[PDB]
Design an enzyme around this catalytic site. Structure first.
Site, mmCIF file in Angstrom:
data_model
loop_
_atom_site.group_PDB
_atom_site.id
_atom_site.type_symbol
_atom_site.label_atom_id
_atom_site.label_comp_id
_atom_site.label_asym_id
_atom_site.label_seq_id
_atom_site.Cartn_x
_atom_site.Cartn_y
_atom_site.Cartn_z
ATOM 1 N N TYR A 167 -24.604 64.552 45.882
ATOM 2 C CA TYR A 167 -25.170 63.201 46.041
ATOM 3 C C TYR A 167 -24.610 62.543 47.313
ATOM 4 C CZ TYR A 167 -25.882 58.212 45.660
ATOM 5 O OH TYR A 167 -26.239 56.900 45.935
ATOM 6 N N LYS A 174 -26.142 61.262 51.178
ATOM 7 C CA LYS A 174 -25.898 59.957 51.798
ATOM 8 C C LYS A 174 -25.239 60.039 53.183
ATOM 9 C CE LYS A 174 -28.242 57.895 48.616
ATOM 10 N NZ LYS A 174 -29.429 57.033 49.009
#
Lengths: 227, 227, 227, 235
Positions: free
Chosen positions: D156, D160
């Protein structure tokens, strides 16, 4: 053999990380100038290293001491190839506003003005070396606190931020003169403490021809603490 | 001791930076697994190195090719201690909006999924070794483009941003397991080009026990380009 | 009306960026303390704003001038909620080694010691306000040169690195006391020059309740220069 | 009224931060296109704003869905001035090696391919607005985990990092076309409702205020940045 023929001048070299670096540089074949405010420290480290080492007592916040240090290195070894700005003092952890002006001024004197003095005084000699094709390296020791502070060392951490920023600025300016400028940020995720010999290895690598394309960087050596 | 006794699996090892590292690591006494989509490239590099190199043709965007690559490494050398995620594809420089989904998806499949697959497949092995006292290293090759882009390589540079970021995330998570995770950013102020030699030296240092306290970092090797 | 009821002390507010922020802050309903070494310039700006402004002449490198400035602020307005450290001096662009000690020390006196003096002298007051539920903000004006220097401004750029670093350190330390600490880096891909009002708006945003969850950052306002 | 006359398309606007941004931008005068994979969520948020809002159902990982989404925004409002890339999915916290390829692929599909699709499909229109003298803005919502990760969210966080890096790459390329590209780093992955140095948690309205500032003319010289809004968490 990586640093054979080279002459390194190292500040704060009478103890801790500075001593570790000087011993490691000398093992790599370098002549070492051991610069420290503590004269017994400098002399002891010089003694332990042996014939490759010159002891030099100096307060690098002082112009005269820097001039004397540089003259002594030049007189003993004929040239300087590597400068390690390692001397640094702090304040004990406390609320930022409790550090008083005298103490603040002293900290800046060593950590900021000392770097400025030691560096600007050796740059002309480095440029002269670079013109004859002998690459030089300036290595500044800063701290993970520069970019990753925890409470209570505000003024100390800010001087280290100065050191990292000055590293980049000198690096872009001096590159065409064949002078590299780098920094190390010593401090834990790896689950053990940083020892002087760890930092010493990163320093010997960065100051060697094996890092000839590396300039303007600040390498964290910290077990992953800055992550 | 530096790389003696170590086994390194290196992707995109059939040319360029990957080949440079494989040859440098082998010279340091490491065994090397030469992984590349280009079968002829992998075999050429492996034959240029000799008995210490194993060629493995693989498309690391494909899970089953990664598994076969890991399985062949372990079958041959008994263990892997170092992973170098070096394989990468880009696009012809161009206005960002002109790169079409098919090509975009291909860039992501190598530069992002390939890293995810090769790394996640070696982690359990790396944890076992680390638990037995044999520290492992993941080295990711990114680019100065990740944090210092110039126009016309937007989607390529962003996958390199992904690589720098996963280096940090994996490092903090794997540090307690005694697995280091580090990155190199290859690129000019130093007045000369970067060669595979240069980047290989930095990779050899960072993958050695001489860097045992270095994790989570992304080291620029760029002659100052990104200052 | 976003800054209605707030009092901002702004150093170097007799011209340039400092003046722009003073006027913008006052347009947002703040009372402003116009601090500058140049008395006639502090008076000019104070006079142009009106009743909401107090002119204060001060050399912030001297503790006595700082104490007097803070006293005058509190005397006139009862409190200070916002400190903007914006006063800065530099050197003509030139080779680093040509900046002599007297000039180096003067730069440090304003850009380093002046920020420490003004900030530390206000922290106890900011802490009091914090305990009464009143959030205070320290805004530090640094520069893109701190992290992206170009050749010839080495020692100036370094002081700006000190300021970005001190922003982070103080931010982490003072967050529990309800004091935010943020920095701006003024400078060009956007193709136009930066105006005082551009920076003024970023400042008015960061010093207002609309940024109540923003602390420890350095925001580049530079049309993309730092990319 | 800082955004009066502007049109903003916001992804993941059916809840959380995106829904917060959408209501805030509309309060500032903007028309808003509410894009979400959850159709009922998009329709609720559009209905709660009124005539200034259009609901669009889309799985932004899919080119076809993105094409329809864009066509719907232009056919309704005539133009788009602001793009907010806010949609994001993560994985439950776990050892990185335990996230399986199908889940990994899904995450990249939304967080990475989705940003690529929505942005590359709006860029030619944004360059037309630019050439006419109308400045446009792309705002990407990343995370403090991109540069300051904690363990268990490796894949995740890495998406980003990609977002932050692409913000920089697009900013430098697109600046002369009069398009700014900026990012926000907030510290559940889309800010939805039912330790921090500042001493409270981030609310959608905090994030929305920063977004409203970054997308306005008061920020016309700000591009390429990744602004942390985290109460000092990342320091």
């Amino acid at each position: 053999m990586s640093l054979e023929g080279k002459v390194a001048l190292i500040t704060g070299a009478g103890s801790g990380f500075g001593e570790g670096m000087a011993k490691r540089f000398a093992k790599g074949g370098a002549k070492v100038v051991i610069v420290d405010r503590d004269k017994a420290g400098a002399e002891r480290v010089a003694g332990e290293i042996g014939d490759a080492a010159l002891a030099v007592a100096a307060d690098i916040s002082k112009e005269a001491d820097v001039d004397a240090a540089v003259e002594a290195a030049l007189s003993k070894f004929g040239k300087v190839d590597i400068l390690v700005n390692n001397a640094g003092i702090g304040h004990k952890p406390q609320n930022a506003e409790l550090v008083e002006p005298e103490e603040f001024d002293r900290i800046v004197g060593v950590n900021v003005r000392g770097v400025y003095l030691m560096t600007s005084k050796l740059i002309p000699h480095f440029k002269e070396n670079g013109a004859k094709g002998q690459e030089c390296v300036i290595l500044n020791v800063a701290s993970t606190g520069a970019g990753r502070p925890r409470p209570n060392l505000a003024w100390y951490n800010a001087t280290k931020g100065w050191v990292v920023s000055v590293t980049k600025a000198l690096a872009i300016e001096l590159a065409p003169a064949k002078i590299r400028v780098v920094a190390l940020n010593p401090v834990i995720p790896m689950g053990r403490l940083l020892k002087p010999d760890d930092l010493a290895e990163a320093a010997a690598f960065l100051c060697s021809p094996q890092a000839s394309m590396i300039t303007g960087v600040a390498l964290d050596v910290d077990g992953g603490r800055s992550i």
